[PDB]
């Protein structure tokens with residue numbers, strides 16, 4: 001497969017302004033008729049190259065003339081000798097039932113639906129499948145009335161008819177020009193939840209949410225979230241919906257989360273369906289996040305789109321920032337900030353050290369679905385947030401306004417967005433642009449000094465970015481470095497230099513530089529990199545006492561959580577080293593004291609408390625080490641939980657009972673008490689065994705919602721409690737017919753700490769509720785084993801790797817996108833020890849040798865083996 005380079009971008013030789021599609025739908029054989037008004041911009045000897053994959057061409061007309069001057073290669077229909085303006089007509093055939101990859105037009109249970117981002121429209125007909133070609137679509141759908149009574153596409157429904165032999169048709173029109181990746185089609189039978197939303201200027205929008213028949217009782221939340229998204233985008237950003245109808249379809253067979261198709265979002269049903277006994281707080285909040293996200297894409301992705309795919313982060317970083325803000329405005333901003341920073345440090349940093357490392361704007365891509373990443377999405381968002389941080393809300397909104405004023409109705413670049421922010425605000429982001437071109441995690445080292453003679457605090461901050469596999473050259477970045485100084489009473493010391501205030505977000509633009517603060521009337525305890533003001537690793541030599549001080553006194557809750565993380569990090573590293581020598585856990589008492597103090601703080605917000613009493617994931621802990629010992633890490637996380645459970649047993653139990661809640665609400669106070677309560681239950685499960693077994697079994701059986709029942713079920717598995725097999729069996733007997741709810745069960749099995757976990761996982765390939773035809777099922781059992789049970793995936797004997805290789809040999813043919821997601825734990829081999837590394841490389845070498853090796857895996861395997 002061939003690599004594409006950002007620096008080869010060229011405006012297309014031809015444009016299409018309008019396309020009229022006809023679909024004669026059938027799952028075995030669908031006929032597509034595509035009539036496209038085109039224009040030649042390039043030179044006359046330059047042919048029209050149309051992208052096309054797995055299509056059966058039936059005819060080619062140019063202004064109704066059967067055309068003889070074309071050929072087919074090799075993903076492409078090449079048409080020669082065209083005029084400056086003409087009507088292209090293609091008829092081709094495709095086969096949805098055969099589409100196991102879920103790219104293009106495929107079959108989701110009984111329905112037919114599309115997924116066209118990034119390059120899936122080319123699996124439907126011959127087209128200029130590239131997001132700098134925008135056109136006005138109209139879409140006619142003919143089908144069997146009984147099997148497909150609903151026929152949907154983008155925009156407004158403008159015509160409809162019956163035919164002989166049980167067939168009907170509908171025609172849709174989307175008046176807004178768009179790249180073909182935003183095209184969508186759905187056909188099938190559904191229950192429909194219908195409501196409306198009236199925009200701040202008075203436009204009444206019909207809202208329609210299509211779900212499998214039976215599931216209307218799981219739709220109101222998603223509908224409520226859509227309304228909330230629409231309202232928030234008006235309030236926060238000044239943006240209103242631009243169409244008369246908003247459709248959302250929930251489908252069970254989908255590779256990602258959801259797709260922002262204009263006026264017709266298609267959603268993985270895991271981010272639509274919720275009922276209090278099937279779904280958790282997290283589900284509810286995710287449903288809110290994704291509905292918001294796809295909604296916010298209507299401006300930051302649709303009304304302004306991407307000139308080319310190398311610009312993905314232009315809409316994803318920005319649109320993620322948007323879902324974060326929305327979630328944060330509506331809920332707890334601190335809790336949101338915290339989890340998003342867990343994700344950055346826990347997962348994204350790993351990618352930015354991996355062989356798949358790339359800038360948020362990639363320079364080279366072989367298969368574009370491999371670039372829907374933590375880096376492009378999450379770090380992308382941190383980069384938007386740094387722009388927010390440097391500009392302030394007011395100027396940020398002016399940049400948004402200028403972005404849209406300049407680029408509405410067109411396809412922009414990352415640079416265009418940055419130019420608009422710069423131009424609207426008058427802040428220079430010239431150097432800041434480097435965040436877009438440079439990969440890897442900057443490391444920021446901080447060294448300080450107090451001078452009591454002069455009452456001055458001196459900070460000497462330096463930065464380096466280690467070379468990455470993709471880039472041998474690295475330079476300093478424009479790093480917004482937010483600080484606060486505390487005196488001995490916990491009061492904030494005003495920042496100043498000779499007479500005048502100083503903004504507390506420092507501009508760290510150099511390899512090394514020094515900042516001097518006057519009037520520091522007492523040796524300060526500093527809070528560094530507040531609110532995670534840049535996506536960097538922080539090096540500063542904290543004492544434990546500085547950190548416990550911050551946990552009591554820091555003004556932002558993030559800082560208090562984060563200080564607790566730095567307190568733990570030191571002892572996680574200590575105890576991994578101890579595990580490696582067969583010694584048991586050592587933990588000074590003042591650490592356990594700090595956590596007792598949080599459990600008993602009457603005034604601390606229970607949401608913050610619960611995050612503090614949530615130990616870093618194994619994936620987070622992993623980022624503390626050059627070489628990862630996944631077994632030591634897993635065993636230490638367990639030991640640390642056991643120790644705290646033991647020290648704090650009484651406090652844990654007290655806080656657990658005090659936070660009991662009779663009623664179940666999805667409301668930020670209630671979620672917070674419940675999250676704290678379950679954090680407590682978790683430690684308790686690792687305490688005294690008879691009490692653990694009684695508490696957990698009781699909670700599972702008494703629970704009136706899935707959040708409480710699953711926290712228990714999950715503790716039973718984690719702590720290997722006596723009641724575990726019964727509870728697991730019960731859950732299965734109750735929920736086996738519901739795939740989404742079983743995912744939770746499969747994840748628990750896949751992540752069990754049991755000795756025979758792999759063996760069970762293998763057996764679960766035969767489970768009634770499992771199937772390899774469903775990505776959600778694949779992800780919850782196989783993916784969760786390989787990505788989320790690193791102790792078992794990395795067994796010394798290599799069984800984890802073989803298991804994955806056998807699974808990937810299947811999926812590479814069936815569904816390369818899901819395969820590529822699953823391969824990721826294997827391309828991290830360079831982070832593990834030599835013997836592990838050899839086995840993993842052997843596994844990658846096996847997979848490289850498959851016939852019909854997919855481009856998706858090829859890209860990762862060749863990078864991982866370099």
Ligand SMILES: N[C@@H](Cc1ccccc1)C(=O)O
Nearest residue numbers: 117118256257258259260372
């Ligand atoms: N554009 C979708 C994600 C997506 C990409 C590619 C395929 C499927 C889904 C989003 O960001 O929400």
Ligand code: NA
Nearest residue numbers: 114115116184
């Ligand atoms: Na689609």
Ligand code: NA
Nearest residue numbers: 015016017134
């Ligand atoms: Na166009």
Ligand code: NA
Nearest residue numbers: 328329331333
């Ligand atoms: Na809030």
Ligand SMILES: [Zn+2]
Nearest residue numbers: 297315316319
């Ligand atoms: Zn997105």
